[PDB]
């Protein structure tokens, strides 16, 4: 308070446009790191398929890779369907 | 100019040069060139006289022409090769075009009339900066691409720089003009040694950089711009003129002073490359540089000139500007010859 509160109030009095712009800018800078949905956004961008999932040669070992799109093993995006 | 603004502009010039000397992408090297050009003009315009405006203009439009030409070369190289890497030019036209595109930046070819003009118009400190720092970047680019130069073009460029610089320096009494012509001659020397061994080019560039630094800061500390004003320094302050003449003898390259070591080593290199007429030609025509060096030395220290009575007050008051690194600069400017083989450190 004191000097800082008086300066904030005087800036709100004299130049409200600058106060609003600085507040919006600071909010838009510091919120995105804190918000948890940011990671979700990245995953959504990873979920969207633009190129074909080119199949790899099944020389045996790999269990995780599905042998058919309907097969359960492999990445799933039920989270996006729910969210 | 606000001192912080000047500091930022100098940092931007240095950052552009560094970007030129550290980037592999051609576009980034051009970006460094552009930042250097952009930040250089206000440094010249610092004093804000019509001379400064004239010189800053003539600097600008020449550099802009050279940089656009450099883009034409880069784009042709990309079209004919598909590479942005600074390795070598895969189209002969592109490189035989960039050779002069990178030449007007150095100011050695008939693309040199801008150099004395800008040097004289702008202040002495910015003149030091222009003649010392503004030559590492294009020379670095030339060093990187030296593997695929047309030797005839580069050697002709070097010869013309040496000849016209030495001759033009004979007919000016203003210190800025004859230093510009001396810089042209040294550009010719380094560019002549460029195609064979770039290490000798780096060594000559370093010697020229330190020695021109010493010369220019001696000029600033003497506060002289014309021959008569410099001659008048003997009454006020004789040690400046005493160091002046030694540094001028180094300018001419008279051994055992430091200035010989490049002129020597360069001659040793190209004669190994079966080039004999060229080294002899340069060795003889450096005497034109030497002539006005001795003319300047004669009317600075070797013959005391008519002074001015008001200097009785000038002797009464000492200097205030420190001129940092000057005493070291003189030492590397005159006696580093016995440590000549240390040039292997550059290699």
């Amino acid at each position: 308070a004191g000097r800082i509160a008086s300066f904030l109030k005087n800036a709100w009095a004299k130049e409200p446009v600058l106060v609003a712009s600085f507040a919006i800018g600071g909010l838009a800078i510091i919120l995105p790191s804190l918000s948890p949905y940011t990671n979700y956004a990245i995953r959504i961008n990873r979920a969207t398929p633009y190129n074909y999932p080119v199949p790899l040669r099944d020389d045996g070992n790999m269990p995780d890779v599905p042998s058919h799109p309907q097969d359960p093993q492999g990445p799933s995006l039920e989270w996006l369907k729910n969210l | 100019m606000n001192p912080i603004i000047y500091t930022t502009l100098i940092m931007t010039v240095m950052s552009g040069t560094m970007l030129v000397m550290i980037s592999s992408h051609w576009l980034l090297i051009w970006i460094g060139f552009e930042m250097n050009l952009l930040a250089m003009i206000p440094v010249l315009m610092k004093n804000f006289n019509p001379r400064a405006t004239e010189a800053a203009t003539k600097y600008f439009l020449t550099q802009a022409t050279a940089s656009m030409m450099l883009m034409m070369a880069i784009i042709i190289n990309l079209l004919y090769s598909g590479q942005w890497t600074i390795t070598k030019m895969f189209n002969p036209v592109a490189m035989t075009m960039m050779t002069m595109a990178l030449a007007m930046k150095l100011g050695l070819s008939p693309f040199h009339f801008w150099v004395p003009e800008v040097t004289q118009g702008i202040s002495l400190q910015a003149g030091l900066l222009l003649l010392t720092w503004q030559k590492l970047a294009p020379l670095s680019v030339l060093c990187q691409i030296s593997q695929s130069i047309n030797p005839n073009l580069m050697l002709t460029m070097a010869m013309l720089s040496i000849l016209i610089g030495g001759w033009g320096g004979l007919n000016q009494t203003q210190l800025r003009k004859i230093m510009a012509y001396s810089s042209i001659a040294h550009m010719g020397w380094m560019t002549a040694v460029l195609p064979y061994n770039t290490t000798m080019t780096i060594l000559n560039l370093l010697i020229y950089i330190t020695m021109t630094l010493a010369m220019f800061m001696l000029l600033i500390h003497s506060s002289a711009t014309t021959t008569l004003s410099l001659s008048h320094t003997w009454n006020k302050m004789p040690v400046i003129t005493s160091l002046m003449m030694v540094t001028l003898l180094s300018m001419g390259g008279l051994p055992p002073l430091s200035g010989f070591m490049p002129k020597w080593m360069i001659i040793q290199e190209m004669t190994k490359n079966e080039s004999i007429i060229m080294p002899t030609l340069m060795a003889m025509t450096a005497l034109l540089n030497l002539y006005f060096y001795m003319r300047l030395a004669y009317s600075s220290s070797l013959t005391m000139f008519p002074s001015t009575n008001n200097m009785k007050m000038k002797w009464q008051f000492e200097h205030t500007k420190q001129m940092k690194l000057l005493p070291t600069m003189i030492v590397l400017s005159t006696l580093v010859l016995p440590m000549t083989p240390a040039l292997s450190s550059l290699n």
């Binding site: 800018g25 800078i29 995105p32 940011t38 956004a41 990245i42 961008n45 990873r46 969207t48 | -």
Partner: protein
């Protein structure tokens, strides 16, 4: 196919309207009729001499400001990448540098017009 056919239609319609405007009305012209208009009395004589523009600094920095929007405009496609952290940092870097440029101009007279 479509875009230049359009453009041609507009330009020929405009040139036509100009033609009917300029050939039909049966003009009668004399020297004092085409004399320059200067609120009645004859002009002092100029209309091409240098006209000072005090926002010359503002006018030129408009060029840099409008230039930056070229860097700015790829954002609608830049948001749809897999590296949202770097994209966000770089977009905020551009916007913060534009804010700094505008603030530097504002404080160091800049946007204020010359007198």
């Amino acid at each position: 196919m479509n875009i230049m056919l359009t453009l041609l239609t507009n330009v020929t319609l405009a040139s036509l309207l100009v033609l009917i405007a300029f050939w039909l009305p049966q003009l009668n012209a004399y020297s004092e009729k085409t004399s320059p208009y200067e609120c009645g009395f004859d002009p002092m004589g100029s209309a091409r001499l240098p006209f000072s523009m005090k926002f010359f600094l503002v006018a030129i920095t408009f060029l840099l400001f409008d230039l930056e929007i070229a860097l700015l405009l790829p954002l609608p496609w830049a948001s749809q990448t897999n590296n949202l952290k770097t994209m966000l940092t770089m977009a905020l870097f551009l916007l913060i540098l534009l804010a700094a440029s505008l603030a530097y101009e504002w404080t160091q007279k800049g946007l204020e017009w010359a007198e």
